[PDB]
Design a binder for this molecule. Sequence first.
Ligand code: HEM
Ligand SMILES: N#C/C(=C1/SC[C@@H](c2ccccc2Cl)S1)n1ccnc1
Length: 404
Amino acid sequence: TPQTTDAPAFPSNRSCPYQLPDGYAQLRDTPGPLHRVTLYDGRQAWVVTKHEAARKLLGDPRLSSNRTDDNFPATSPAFEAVRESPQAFIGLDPPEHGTRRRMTISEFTVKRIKGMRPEVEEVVHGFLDEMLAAGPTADLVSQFALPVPSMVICRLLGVPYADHEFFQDASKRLVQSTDAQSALTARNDLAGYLDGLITQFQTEPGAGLVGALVADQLANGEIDREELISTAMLLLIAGHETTASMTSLSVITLLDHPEQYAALRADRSLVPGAVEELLRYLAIADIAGGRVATADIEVEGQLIRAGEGVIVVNSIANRDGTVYEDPDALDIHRSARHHLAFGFGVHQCLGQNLARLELEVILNALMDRVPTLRLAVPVEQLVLRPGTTIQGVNELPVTWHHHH
Ligand code: HEM
Ligand SMILES: N#C/C(=C1/SC[C@@H](c2ccccc2Cl)S1)n1ccnc1
């Protein structure tokens, strides 16, 4: 009795940091914008696997972002720690979505991100100062890739970096837990921490976005205290984990494509385009593609019924050869325009240009200060995170030429 199914298990795990899982390549190749999958609990759901259809469905308000809905597509038991939890605007639909998102946009404008560049460069070179002073070997994740965005997002939020070991540990536990209880505990750890910060700011107004939300919107009853906690937690976790993963995966990927890494070093005007290509190619945030239909939607002859879960798999859409010629070739010179690594539409990543700024500063700094950087272990020996979380590696051993 054959085991072939027409609803393969989803998600799949990467076997190479920068390649689609074998099962995803299969979905990429199968014609049609949609494909059935089976989630961890046996429920069937749709995945979107082509680029233009992914944009269209991300733009369709009939695909709700409401994670509290019973039919929202959960890809791991740990999701249940989010289904029964208060809801940042990543999980809201218009019109509620806009009222909450606009409370935070002032910290992520182009003018603010520009103003942050000297501060980001200082943080980047500070952690490189310390890592290089100590000499190889080092774990790039714990010594550089994680602390840099953590320090940056703490200052943006007004979260004291002195507490970094606490919330770095909680952030990891929340995002990578494979059971609801572990994720729920980390959620509650972070919430209790953030609730105390709020009360402190009500005594002594503080800097940063959390300080501003306490002094203004909270004081005016325009955001619930618990929504403020959920909102700060979203930005804190998003600010830590995603950028850190782009750094480690970009280093791995660039060292596996030395001709392009050399071309990048030789002409730094290529770095912004290289960042876009790396974002398209590494597409680390499929876990951010879940949707639930609130009405029937006809998609190129296929029918999404009201109440069905839909996952917009931007990593697969980003390998659509009708948009990106030879889509599985890394090409830092190609047009990676219109990639979906940050989503599309009303929920397109609030932090996208901070992430672009941090990756540019980081790649230039590594090429400037550590041109002899190389992995200290074979790529095959790295441990990749599973497809139920943000893609990446939890450790990245590196070495380099030690200058005394
Ligand atoms: C390379 C790094 C990053 C990637 C690949 C990424 C990816 C994404 C994606 C795909 C979405 C859309 C989710 C959806 O449609 O439901 C999203 C939304 C979001 N991201 Fe990021 N992100 C990154 C970095 C950041 C950073 C540094 C922040 C800083 C706070 C951040 C904050 C957010 C927020 C707040 C949202 C929700 C926006 C909304 O619902 O209106 N992200 N991100
Ligand atoms: N989607 C998404 C996304 C997230 S980071 C915070 C994640 C989270 C997971 C489980 C429980 C609570 C929370 Cl708050 S969900 N992200 C990543 C980059 N930009 C946005």
